[PDB]
Amino acid sequence: SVIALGSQEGALHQALAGAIPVEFSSNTVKLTSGHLKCRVKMEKLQLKGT
Amino acid sequence: FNCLGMSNRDFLEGVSGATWVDLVLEGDSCVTIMSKDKPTIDVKMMNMEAANLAEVRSYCYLATVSDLSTKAACPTMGEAHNDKRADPAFVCRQGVVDRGWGNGCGLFGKGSIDTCAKFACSTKAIGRTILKENIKYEVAIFVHGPTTVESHGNYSTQVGATQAGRFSITPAAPSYTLKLGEYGEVTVDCEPRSGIDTNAYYVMTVGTKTFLVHREWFMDLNLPWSSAGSTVWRNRETLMEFEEPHATKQSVIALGSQEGALHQALAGAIPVEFSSNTVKLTSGHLKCRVKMEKLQLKGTTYGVCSKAFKFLGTPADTGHGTVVLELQYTGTDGPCKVPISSVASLNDLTPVGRLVTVNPFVSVATANAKVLIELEPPFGDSYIVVGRGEQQINHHWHKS
Amino acid sequence: ANLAEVRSYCYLATVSDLSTKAACPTMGEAHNDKRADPAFVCRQGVVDRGWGNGCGLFGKGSIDTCAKFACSTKAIGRTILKENIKYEVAIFVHGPTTVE
Amino acid sequence: YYVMTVGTKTFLVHREWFMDLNLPWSSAGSTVWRNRETLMEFEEPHATKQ
Secondary structure, eight states, X not given: OXXXXXXXXXXXXXXXXXXXXXOEETTEEOXXXXXXXXXXXXXXXXXXXX | OOOTTOSSEEEEEOSTTOSOOEEEEETTOEEEEEETTEEEEEEEXXXXXXXXXXXXXXXXXXXXXXXXXXXXXXXXXXXXXXXXXXXXXXXXXXXXXXXXXXXXXXXXEEEEEEEEEEOOOSEEEEEEEOOOOOEXXXXXXXXXXXXXXXXXXXXXXXXXXXXXXXXXXXXXXXXXXXXXXXXXXXXXXXXXXXXXXXXXXXXEEETTEEEEEEHHHHHSSOSOBOSSSSOOBOGGGSOOOOOOXXXXXXXXXXXXXXXXXXXXXXXXXXXXXXXXXXXXXXXXEEEEEEEOTTBOOOSOSSOBOOSOEEEOSOOEEOSSSOEEEEEEXXXXXXXXXXXXXXXXXXXXXXXXXXXXXXXXXXXXXXXXXXXXXXXXXXXXXXXXXXXXXXXXEEEEEEEO | OOOEEEEEEEEOOOOOOOOEEEOOTTSOOOOOGGGSXXXXXXXXXXXXXXXXXXXXXXXXXXXXXXXXXXXXEEEEEEEOOOOOOOOOOOOOOOOSOOOO | XXXXXXXXXXXXXXXXXXXXXXSOBOSSSSOOBOGXXXXXXXXXXXXXXX
């Protein structure tokens, strides 16, 4: 008897929360996962109607 | 229906001067019983069936997480009531969203939100119970009368030879007296009682692979469920919805179905074959009392076989401390007793190997008949021997 | 605005075809022809037997059966190299405005 | 005990010492398994020649 082992998606699902969810199209991964360190230089930012 | 060749075999000698024996039978097991001056027999439980189960719970793995709803409420306007809250048509849950002018509302701050998603079931990991009157047992009894490698396993031949039988036991009538022709009869009084494993375990059904799980592991699990109705409760497993959205759309992602949750707890619960309405217990046992003062020998008034006897091949190890082998009788004479014993050293006077196939004998008068024999030889080296003097043959053996 | 796969775990089907290369006691091991190509997955074992089932002597006989293997639902996974990554930053100025 | 044959000098060895030894092997076929004894290959080379 070569019983096909029952496929229990629980094994996967169970470890859901651990890994963060992300929208993915065939070739793309929109990072939300991701961050960006910036330096907002603005000595050129100026008031108006003063 | 007989013991030879099975790995779950147990040999028994009831008691001293006992015409009966108390025994225990289970699923795929067999038992060979010996008794002074009486045929050897094999009691064996064939099948365990309910000829009436009932469902108890039903956990689901699911689909329908398609329809959506988002009843919006502006800040200070109170809570939000979604019409999809009148019928279990959907599952609703409230939340709040930071908003104001930016998105159509007059003031700035937290606004109510009560969305809803739909719920129906797909694959129901159904489960049921096993009440300790529909339980019937099927016990098969064999008689170690004349046989051959061939006929030994043929139920037909054996029944025909009145050296076998298959009857059933029920709580209604827990006993039976199986008649075996001139061999008299054997009367078992099996007592349907069993634990065996107590009904305490639930009947887990998953797609195709049925299993036997612990009441609690089952009952106390986390998954949607429904007793005997189309109504489902705790469907909260329609989770991972609260992206903590906007009044426009609250993503209602269908929770990934991971059969691992189930599978992972495989080994724990014992597996069992289950047909729509039946559960063959292997889980189950049966305490019997094989009364057999009515079991009797046959062909005891015949003379000893006196003609050459040839082996038909190296005896084989049953894996039980006994060996099997098949003889051939050059003899032309009819039904005579087969002179076979186990001797510690050539030409010893007293035997040492007890025969399982007690009081063996050539069934027919048709020369060159075959005879099957199972015997337990002593440990270490020994000799199997058939016939005596210069007719006698022999074959050595060494048990460990 | 270029990923690449790395592994692929499966949940499966094809467990349909069977095989059972039998070997009598003392006749050694059993070699199933379905062992030449990954067409099937084979595994050996031993069975108590003898006259009862066609064999000459009594005892443990070799056994090497095989089942087939192909995949159904591949729980695929890939990598994310740290030049195709572009960011979109939006800057606002708190100049005159209305709720609108 | 097994029947050990080596070139010319035949011997009688213990089932296990024999069966449970480390060397390539083949039952009754031209097919060989555990040929891993084709060892000492991994000079941990270059794509050109290992």
